[PDB]
Amino acid sequence: YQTERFTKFSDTLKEFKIEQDPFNIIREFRSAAGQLALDLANSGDESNVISSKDWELEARFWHLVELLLVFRNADLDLDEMELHPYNSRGLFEKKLMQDNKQLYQIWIVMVWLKENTYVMERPKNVPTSKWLNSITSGGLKSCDLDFPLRENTNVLDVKDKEEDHIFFKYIYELILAGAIDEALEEAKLSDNISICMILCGIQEYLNPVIDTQIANEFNTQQGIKKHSLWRRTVYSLSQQAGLDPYERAIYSYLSGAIPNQEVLQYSDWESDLHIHLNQILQTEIENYLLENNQVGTDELILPLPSHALTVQEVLNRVASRHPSESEHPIRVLMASVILDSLPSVIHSSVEMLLDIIDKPYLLRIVTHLAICLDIINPGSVEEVDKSKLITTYISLLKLQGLYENIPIYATFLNESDCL
Amino acid sequence: KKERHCRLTSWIVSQIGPEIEEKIRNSSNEIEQIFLYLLLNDVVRASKLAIESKNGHLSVLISYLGSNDPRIRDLAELQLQKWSTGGCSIDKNISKIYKLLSGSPFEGLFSLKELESEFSWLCLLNLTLCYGQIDEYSLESLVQSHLDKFSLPYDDPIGVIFQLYAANE
Amino acid sequence: RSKADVERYIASVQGSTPSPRQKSMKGFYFAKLYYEAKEYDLAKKYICTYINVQERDPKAHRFLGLLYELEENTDKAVECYRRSVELNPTQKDLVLKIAELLCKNDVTDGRAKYWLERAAKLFPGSPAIYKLKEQLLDCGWNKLFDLIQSELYVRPDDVHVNIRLVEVYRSTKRLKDAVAHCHEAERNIALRSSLEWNSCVVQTLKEYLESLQCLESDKSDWRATNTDLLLAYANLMLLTLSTRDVQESRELLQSFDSALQSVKSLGGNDELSATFLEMKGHFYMHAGSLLLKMGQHSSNVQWRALSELAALCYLIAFQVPRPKIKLIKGEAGQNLLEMMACDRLSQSGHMLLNLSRGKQDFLKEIVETFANKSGQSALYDALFSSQSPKDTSFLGSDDIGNIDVREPELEDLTRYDVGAIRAHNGSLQHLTWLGLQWNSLPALPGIRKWLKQLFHHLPHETSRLETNAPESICILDLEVFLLGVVYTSHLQLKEKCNSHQPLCLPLPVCKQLCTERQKSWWDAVCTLIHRKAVPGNVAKLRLLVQHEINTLRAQEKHGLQPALLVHWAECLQKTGSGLNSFYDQREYMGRSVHYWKKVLPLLKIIKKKNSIPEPIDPLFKHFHSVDIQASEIVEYEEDAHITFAILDAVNGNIEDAVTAFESIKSVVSYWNLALIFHRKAEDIENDALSPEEQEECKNYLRKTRDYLIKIIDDSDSNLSVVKKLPVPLESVKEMLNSVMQE
Amino acid sequence: VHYWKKVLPLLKIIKKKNSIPEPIDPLFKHFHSVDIQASEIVEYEEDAHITFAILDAVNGNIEDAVTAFESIKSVVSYWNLALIFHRKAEDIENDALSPEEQEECKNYLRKTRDYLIKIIDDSDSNLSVVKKLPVPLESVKEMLNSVMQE
């Protein structure tokens, strides 16, 4: 049956033109692609695993589109936040994310990135308690994480290191996926209290009593006041070798830094891009705080880089670092959406019809995207480009023998007359 | 309340300053020094020395001292019970630092009360006031909490003033 | 305020914040009031100091640039805008300004060219963009001509540019080319609707008539150009009456009448003669509309006398026969002429009626009293000043012979409207007017046919109804839209006159009858469909349409009062229930059921006398004038249950449809019961099949006969039931004749 | 039911992929080895709803228990549905009483038979279901023998 696909997308358009909000179209496009992603994936010829991934990718694209256009377009402007110098850093961070839409967009994108991150299954047969092997062998004179750092790592049993590896890797995957609550649960429950505690430093300080404008979200002070310190402390910890590469990786991510080579070598376009947007973000916040004298000089223990990249440049670098992946045609759209250069790319792939015909999803996707765009933002895509796109896709509806559902797509030109 | 607390604790640090600096002068062990820096309510230099002496995890932990995060409090205490039930051996000063993170450094079961004989009473009171459970208590009932654990010398007047302050009701 | 009010506030904040930094940070808010007190050498230094501390504020920098603009210091003003623009790129209007000012001061530097390119991509093909393109060139005749031509290639519908082409032709005194383009451009439907273009058309033609070149060249094409002048006059008259004031409209009439008098003498049997015929009608129609405009403002005695006079004018117009279309040289020309004919009969038609509904056979009196030549002088009197020579005025010399004095037939009127939908480029003004004119009549207009005449091959319903993307726009959406526009418009005007007839206003005289929101949508979807949008503005137009789709389909956060939904539901049921084909029946019934399914939850809350959650900035204004009452709830629930049954029948659930239809003894349920009983009989009626089954088959045909007879019996007895018939009475009788002969 | 009532608030926060507040010196060591995942949440909510229904049945809210049991087609819900349908039949089955009521009483015993048969049919087919039985398979068959001889 699967050669139904176009129906689903077409179907969604029917429902829209007929209850005469348009963001639902895309939401459905997403779900549609996802549903199809499942079909080709389950039981299939290994020629299908490929086009299955091109559907999952499809789906992620629709999601990213929804998220960003919702934020950008459903922008109806709220009330400005008036801080005082007595206010906590927490509030200033919030203010920053409110006022600077460019940067919040980075947040949105990171959220999307996390959403679609793979995490291993929870490690089984985890041991009763930490470093149990070393303790049992005798030779841990101190039971604290820093003991084998104070003096040769030869202290820790091999099996203990192997388990610490399992743990820190799992925690790392969870952190990259946004699963911070799960990471704290794992830390707690796996007898890694001190690491847990480390994960608690992630929050900026708020006090509901002082920072009135969040006395709703909070009933109790929380987060840590000397955060610039925390951050250097963690970063330095991240640079100290004789720690497991995933642990160092974790601290890197937390300090707004770029994890060690041993770990980073396995990160893909999404993972890598995520890492570097995290860096942009971290740097930008800490700079925002410095420009408002909410950082205390004592805390500038160490040099961290102060110069934030632009999303443009991060993308360019990550691209050159992952050319194959970068060049994949829906991930180009992903980037195009991220930079807003989107009608830009529409008109572009339009002129590539004048090695876009070779891949099937593309001509469809661009067309339905163009439709959505001009629905949500009348004017968005050049009238001509709509004409050209629908023209060509329609002729494929004909080549597929689905003339049945051509009128729906017609509802965008007087050129429709000619059908 | 925060303002008053900060001035009181800066002042106590003014007083205990040389005592502790002397003690840091004579220590032969890095983790002990880290602890003493916590005795001067200097979280940052403790964190730094930790970092330098290659005690990095501790270093991170240290950064919590003075945020009263009850999660961290109950976790630190938990770690301490687990050690104090088997725990073949834990360094004498790491346990002290964890006990500081517990928020109840004498009020306790790994207790710093024995430090009664090694430090000015004021020095230990600083520990209760800085870590101790700042948010949940009023300055007065906090100070009172500490005094309830230690008799001060009858003749000492700065002692007397703390007692009159805590005595409130 | 004064000088004291602002300079005394100096000591107000000086005593509140005395440090230099905060003293200078108040400079912008100090300068805020000196700009209001007409102090520009002072306001300049106040803002300039705030700029000394707040050097990154795009608002302050622009404010100084706007102040240097009042000072006419271009070099200083431009630089200020630049800083605000480089700080904040979203300030599009400043990119135009910079480009606007750079081209006016000096073009020698390429910087003026650069900023003009950006200004173009921020405002695709806006009216100002070309203006700047011409300014930059100014700093030679052949050079200007090429710009306009290259500009007209991609922008043929721009009023200003085409005007400039005529002006350039006129500057080189090659007027023959000026009229030539003027003639070939009178085929453009957009330009024909432009007031300023038609004004240019009237002049460039007259200039050519008097021009030495017109006589020398030949007298063969003289008639051809002369036709366009009359056409231009008609279009110009339609527009001048609506926008311009009483004085200007009357003045245009005299030029029109002079032209008519100068043309009638030639006569003949060609396009010019045929054009004179149709334009003659327009003259009176517009003259009648012109008459009614004056009386509206005036007293009652003048109103009746003027409306009496106008009624005669519209009558004269309506009488004028359909022009001889075959007699024109080309297909475009003849179709145009006919289009205008339909417009004349339609507009004058509804006016004739609305004025005749006031009294009984009011029309007869109008003719019997003013058809007399005395009326011709009373018409010339009220319209014009008697001082002008009454000999060369067409109005005074026309032979008013045998006025038909026959009120118009609705069926004829419908085909006039449908044929004239494209008369005024389908402006929502045009349709909302017609829709309102039919709001008082017993026969309803073929809206679905109007839309088919406008957006050809636009599907009735789009397959991809799931999303609101505006590529899925359907004739139903539009039909659903116009219904609300008219239902909304009527209520708004009803409220207006209540505070202070609404039907009686002629189309030009009345103002915008729809909300600018609604008008913006229609203009957008129109430009989009007809493929006359702008590549840059495509995305904006597309979204503008998308915004309203979810309301036309009663989706998330629809700004729809329950009464308007019900009106949509029933208006589509009865619209669909009268259609012949199944495809159309299904669609219209589907949408009707859809809207019904959205109302009933509201009606149930309203049924227990609770409050409806009012909307947020609705698309169709709410009104308590038509708020649903409990007295009418049970009826809608019943009328809806019919609409459900009808769709059940069309889908195949005959058992449930009949079970429902039979439950309510309604005239409409008979026509449905009958129509579906007849089908079960006719198919099985003549093939070889079990005899017992044949008897059961005949039995259904017997039921059909009975239900049709119940319709006619109850129909002839009461008039209210005649109006409830889902199809015409004669159509019901038509079936019965065939039913019984079977 | 008590412990269930304490978990479900946690599962709901875990259902939306948030963080659980870790404990202070817990009595039973936490482990990320068995940390609950979204993949298993809907199951627990279902398995809990059974435990609710079972207690409702034991307390007397048969109407709500059956309404819940029937909602989920689980092997365990059969044994409960069957066990409670059998009791409504057995008590009313032999005393002098309205004949119409007697027919309704027998009707329940007919449902008991059917649910026990569904248990054995699904049980013999698949092993995973055999382990889900709230009581031993032979015990289910034991009742059925007596159910039908009644």
Side-chain angles (χ1 to χ4, degrees), chain B residues 82-111:
Chain B
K82 280 182 149 311
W83 289 333
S84 61
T85 336
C88 100
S89 303
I90 216 305
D91 176 284
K92 288 168 177 181
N93 297 297
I94 280 101
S95 62
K96 291 175 198 175
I97 301 175
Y98 269 71
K99 193 56 166 195
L100 299 180
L101 298 145
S102 85
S104 318
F106 318 99
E107 343 188 327
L109 90 113
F110 228 113
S111 189

XYZ file of all heavy atoms in Angstrom, chain B residues 82-111:
229
model
N 26.887 6.000 54.779
C 27.365 4.850 54.029
C 28.805 4.593 54.405
O 29.200 3.438 54.571
C 27.225 5.061 52.521
C 25.818 4.827 52.003
C 25.738 5.008 50.497
C 24.684 4.104 49.878
N 24.843 2.710 50.348
N 29.614 5.647 54.496
C 30.992 5.439 54.933
C 30.986 4.934 56.384
O 31.686 3.974 56.720
C 31.818 6.718 54.802
C 32.116 7.076 53.384
C 32.198 6.224 52.321
C 32.422 8.379 52.879
N 32.501 6.924 51.179
C 32.654 8.248 51.498
C 32.514 9.646 53.461
C 32.974 9.335 50.689
C 32.828 10.723 52.660
C 33.054 10.564 51.288
N 30.200 5.587 57.247
C 30.202 5.244 58.670
C 29.348 4.005 58.930
O 28.682 3.889 59.960
C 29.711 6.417 59.528
O 28.381 6.796 59.217
N 29.402 3.074 57.985
C 28.749 1.775 58.089
C 29.473 0.879 57.070
O 28.995 0.655 55.958
C 27.238 1.840 57.810
O 26.753 3.168 58.054
C 26.496 0.856 58.700
N 30.647 0.396 57.471
C 31.572 -0.286 56.587
C 32.648 0.742 56.303
O 33.558 0.936 57.109
N 32.491 1.436 55.177
C 33.484 2.338 54.610
C 34.934 2.202 55.027
O 35.424 3.053 55.777
N 35.607 1.149 54.556
C 36.869 0.667 55.141
C 37.801 1.779 55.634
O 38.449 1.630 56.668
C 37.618 -0.212 54.130
S 38.969 0.608 53.243
N 37.831 2.895 54.906
C 38.661 4.056 55.247
C 38.275 5.250 54.374
O 38.212 5.138 53.153
C 40.156 3.760 55.065
O 40.581 2.641 55.822
N 38.058 6.400 55.006
C 37.892 7.656 54.282
C 38.839 8.685 54.913
O 38.993 8.719 56.138
C 36.384 8.115 54.314
C 35.928 8.794 53.008
C 36.056 8.951 55.554
C 36.743 9.971 52.558
N 39.527 9.458 54.075
C 40.442 10.499 54.544
C 39.776 11.375 55.595
O 38.629 11.793 55.441
C 40.964 11.342 53.386
C 41.844 12.493 53.843
O 41.308 13.500 54.350
O 43.079 12.387 53.694
N 40.512 11.634 56.666
C 40.018 12.396 57.804
C 39.472 13.795 57.465
O 38.553 14.267 58.133
C 41.131 12.505 58.848
C 41.402 11.185 59.569
C 42.694 11.231 60.373
C 42.909 9.939 61.150
N 44.159 9.985 61.961
N 40.012 14.457 56.445
C 39.540 15.807 56.122
C 38.443 15.860 55.057
O 37.640 16.797 55.025
C 40.714 16.678 55.677
C 41.748 16.865 56.771
O 41.462 17.437 57.821
N 42.962 16.382 56.525
N 38.389 14.851 54.196
C 37.309 14.769 53.221
C 35.987 14.557 53.936
O 34.962 15.143 53.571
C 37.536 13.666 52.188
C 38.508 14.174 51.124
C 36.260 13.384 51.435
C 39.908 13.696 51.273
N 36.023 13.747 54.984
C 34.827 13.520 55.763
C 34.422 14.823 56.436
O 33.235 15.142 56.478
C 35.063 12.412 56.789
O 36.081 12.775 57.702
N 35.384 15.573 56.971
C 35.075 16.878 57.557
C 34.359 17.787 56.550
O 33.346 18.424 56.872
C 36.335 17.577 58.078
C 36.983 16.936 59.297
C 38.283 17.652 59.647
C 39.176 16.813 60.542
N 40.486 17.485 60.775
N 34.876 17.825 55.323
C 34.286 18.679 54.295
C 32.870 18.231 53.933
O 31.962 19.065 53.752
C 35.158 18.707 53.035
C 36.551 19.235 53.383
C 34.513 19.572 51.972
C 37.530 19.191 52.243
N 32.667 16.919 53.872
C 31.343 16.399 53.567
C 30.403 16.799 54.686
O 29.244 17.132 54.445
C 31.353 14.882 53.398
C 31.593 14.408 51.988
C 32.835 14.536 51.387
C 30.568 13.822 51.259
C 33.046 14.107 50.090
C 30.771 13.381 49.969
C 32.011 13.528 49.388
O 32.216 13.079 48.107
N 30.915 16.757 55.914
C 30.122 17.094 57.088
C 29.690 18.558 57.004
O 28.570 18.901 57.384
C 30.893 16.820 58.383
C 30.015 16.852 59.635
C 28.856 15.860 59.522
C 28.175 15.605 60.862
N 27.303 14.397 60.814
N 30.581 19.419 56.516
C 30.193 20.800 56.213
C 29.075 20.863 55.174
O 28.136 21.645 55.325
C 31.395 21.628 55.750
C 32.531 21.771 56.765
C 33.650 22.620 56.187
C 32.012 22.382 58.061
N 29.169 20.060 54.119
C 28.085 20.040 53.133
C 26.764 19.514 53.702
O 25.692 19.838 53.194
C 28.462 19.208 51.909
C 29.662 19.666 51.085
C 30.417 18.467 50.550
C 29.193 20.570 49.950
N 26.846 18.715 54.761
C 25.658 18.155 55.403
C 24.778 19.208 56.078
O 23.593 18.971 56.303
C 26.057 17.083 56.422
O 26.366 17.654 57.681
N 25.357 20.354 56.415
C 24.589 21.456 56.974
C 24.405 21.406 58.481
O 23.759 22.277 59.060
N 24.957 20.373 59.112
C 24.808 20.156 60.555
C 26.099 19.569 61.136
O 26.134 18.402 61.532
C 23.620 19.243 60.856
O 22.503 19.580 60.054
N 27.158 20.396 61.220
C 28.517 19.857 61.365
C 28.836 19.354 62.766
O 29.756 18.547 62.923
C 29.421 21.060 61.063
C 28.531 22.243 60.935
C 27.154 21.771 60.695
N 28.073 19.785 63.766
C 28.274 19.239 65.098
C 27.033 18.443 65.452
O 27.109 17.300 65.898
C 28.497 20.398 66.071
C 29.401 21.468 65.519
C 28.862 22.623 64.975
C 30.775 21.301 65.499
C 29.678 23.608 64.445
C 31.595 22.285 64.973
C 31.048 23.437 64.447
N 25.884 19.076 65.228
C 24.540 18.489 65.357
C 24.383 17.048 64.794
O 23.295 16.679 64.365
C 23.559 19.426 64.624
C 24.176 20.806 64.372
C 23.190 21.815 63.818
O 22.283 21.415 63.057
O 23.331 23.012 64.144
N 25.422 16.209 64.872
C 25.580 15.158 63.875
C 26.115 13.798 64.280
O 26.434 13.544 65.443
N 26.184 12.912 63.289
C 26.902 11.635 63.370
C 28.092 11.494 62.390
O 28.183 10.590 61.558
C 25.861 10.512 63.198
C 25.445 9.899 61.852
C 25.868 8.445 61.729
C 23.942 10.062 61.640
N 29.036 12.409 62.578
C 30.397 12.349 62.058
C 31.010 13.651 62.504
O 31.555 14.416 61.709
C 30.460 12.231 60.529
C 31.397 11.161 60.035
C 30.908 10.036 59.387
C 32.765 11.288 60.200
C 31.775 9.055 58.928
C 33.632 10.310 59.748
C 33.137 9.193 59.111
N 30.907 13.894 63.801
C 30.741 15.251 64.279
C 32.068 15.973 64.451
O 33.067 15.410 64.897
C 29.976 15.241 65.604
O 29.617 16.554 65.985
